[PDB]
Design a protein around this ligand. Structure first.
Ligand SMILES: [Zn+2]
Length: 204
């Protein structure tokens, strides 16, 4: 309501580092239009949700900004992040109703302001489970086979280069693609939940 999704925070962060790239070019005269662009993208992410960010905007509009100063201010923003809600045991069991033996994720390994989706591996069946909220704000889930033999490439969820493996959904006729073996690393890269929805749609 007065907070933002984890994936929007990843985007805000990506925009702040882009500002630093511009500042690294010692010629803000040529890059003024880009600067105002970046600043307005960050602000709009908060305007949508009625959060006052005219403050952080002022703070970051400074050619002498660097990583450290940015990170502190960004960490101060973490307070506005809508945490990922992890389903109860019965909700999880219902999502994966057909799975008789369901390995649960380790809640100690999970920071809920750092995930847009919950992805965890069951190495004993070479499986990955993925849980998320859909467009109607309700839980969905999928699982599939993922080989532990990783190959470097573009993850088809977050679109970045990572240690990836082929995730095969049942849908046999198998549908799938290469994704981050480690979904927690993926979630640090994922700047648009739509990317996950489009992956799901194409393999489901
Ligand atoms: Zn990824």
């Amino acid at each position: 309501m007065n907070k933002i999704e984890v994936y929007k925070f990843v985007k805000v962060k990506q925009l702040v580092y882009q500002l630093i790239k511009l500042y690294r070019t010692n010629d803000m005269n040529s890059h003024k239009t880009q600067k105002d662009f970046l600043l307005n993208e960050i602000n709009d992410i908060f305007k949508e949700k009625d959060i006052d960010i005219s403050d952080f905007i002022t703070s970051i509009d400074d050619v002498k900004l660097t990583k450290k100063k940015a990170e502190h201010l960004l960490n101060e923003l973490k307070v506005y992040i809508q945490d990922f809600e992890i389903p109860s045991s019965s909700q999880l069991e219902k999502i994966f109703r057909k799975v008789k033996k369901l390995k649960r994720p380790d809640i100690n390994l999970i920071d809920t302001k750092e995930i847009s989706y919950l992805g965890w591996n069951d190495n004993s069946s070479n499986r990955k489970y993925i849980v998320y909220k859909n467009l109607d704000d309700k839980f969905e889930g999928i699982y599939g086979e993922i080989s532990p033999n990783k190959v470097k490439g573009f993850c088809k969820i977050c679109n970045q280069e990572s240690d990836t493996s082929l995730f095969l959904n049942k849908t046999y006729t198998k549908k799938g693609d290469y994704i981050c073996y480690d979904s927690f690393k993926c979630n640090q890269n994922l700047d648009d939940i739509n990317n996950l929805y489009e992956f799901i749609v194409k393999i489901k």
